[PDB]
Amino acid sequence: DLVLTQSPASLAVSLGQRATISCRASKSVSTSGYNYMHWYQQKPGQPPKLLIYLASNLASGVPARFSGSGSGTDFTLNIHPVEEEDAATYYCLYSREFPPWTFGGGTKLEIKRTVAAPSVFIFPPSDEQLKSGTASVVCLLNNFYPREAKVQWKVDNALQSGNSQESVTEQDSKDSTYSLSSTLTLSKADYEKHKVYACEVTHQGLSSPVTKSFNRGEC
């Protein structure tokens, strides 16, 4: 049977530098004289897109910065210079004119850029939600790098826990940054029990933690 394993699983490469991805086949795919290795690129929320077919030929509408090499069992996909729009997952694919097909496990590619601090904002609950019995307080961290970030909620300066959730956007294909949203959910009752709601952010782009807050009733 044929299995393809890719190296590495993840890779972070500086904008403008070279990205090298590998794929090894459990057995030779060049015995017929042709190199049956293909490469696909897939960005979040989109279907795969062919980049290279037959180990080294560029697919349709693929910039020359992408290239491929190898034969037998070892192949590599090369990107140079890496651009922000290249943040994606890359898969090698084995197959002849007709199937079967065998995909490799994939290689996530993150674009590395200069550190950037997040812009922090906070949103007190809306009147209509409060009216329905709950209170959601949202904290937004906009356009930052690297992805590593820490958000702490404090109600009347008391660190909250187990009552908040967050999601980070995929790396921006334009400027290579991230954005994060954190939601502190509380019952109307609980919410009206306290006065100060704050979001405290720590990111290697901030000299010292930044805090955003408001007082219930102020807004």
Binding site: F103, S126, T169
Partner: protein, 220 residues
């Protein structure tokens, strides 16, 4: 040139069966046939198998025997993927593809299938008002909180598509209630909070819910 459109997202309970469609822009699928690919949330691509366009003879990959069936409804150059006795492990996005040559590779945008016992439920849309607390420099941030819905997905656009710059719609989080929640925000000129109107358009097909929430400024 060619383009495959697939049927929308589906919600089924375990044990049920689901049937997804793939339609070409051309008048039929090429001589090479058609392929189906599976992608579980956050996982890799996995070839399911293929079906011959002429012989209608399907071939299934090892890990996809018994419960899966590829069918050709040539009646309108359409192909179908059927899965019976749905399990949790079937929760994934299914892609259909076909090719006429090395340079002619066409993919469908995939059909997201969700296997769960949870009931469908439209979201509530709450405004994330811009104010002194969501302003920095000349930029003001504002948004919409789409809370308590099931199943995925939800789409959000701003001012019917007019505003798209600086828009950030985050990945939905699954709350302890088993319901999803998501937020969509946008940064717009602080002064343009007296010259412009801002409305988020939320669409949650699974429950046929369409909401338009105008987001107004808050003084404090």
């Amino acid at each position: 040139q060619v383009q495959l459109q697939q049927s929308g997202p589906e919600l089924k309970k375990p044990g049920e069966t689901v049937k997804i469609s793939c339609k070409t822009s051309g008048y039929s699928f090429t001589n090479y046939g058609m392929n189906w690919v599976k992608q579980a949330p956050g996982k890799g691509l996995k070839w399911m198998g293929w079906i011959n366009t002429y012989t209608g003879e399907p071939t299934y990959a090892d890990d996809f025997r018994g419960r899966f069936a590829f069918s050709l409804a040539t009646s309108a150059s359409t192909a179908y993927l059927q899965i019976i006795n749905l399990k949790n492990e079937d929760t994934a996005t299914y892609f259909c593809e076909t090719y006429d040559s090395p340079l002619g590779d066409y993919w469908g945008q995939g059909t997201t299938v969700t296997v769960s016992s949870a009931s469908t439920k439209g979201p509530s849309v709450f405004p994330l008002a811009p104010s002194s607390k969501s302003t920095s420099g000349g930029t003001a941030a504002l948004g919409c909180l789409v809370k308590d819905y099931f199943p995925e997905p939800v789409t959000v656009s701003w001012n019917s598509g007019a505003l798209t710059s600086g828009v950030h719609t985050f990945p939905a989080v699954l709350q302890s209630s088993g319901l999803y929640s998501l937020s969509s925000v946008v940064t717009v000129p602080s002064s343009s909070l007296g010259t412009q109107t801002y409305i988020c358009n939320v669409n949650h097909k699974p429950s046929n819910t369409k909401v338009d929430k105008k987001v107004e400024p808050k003084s404090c």
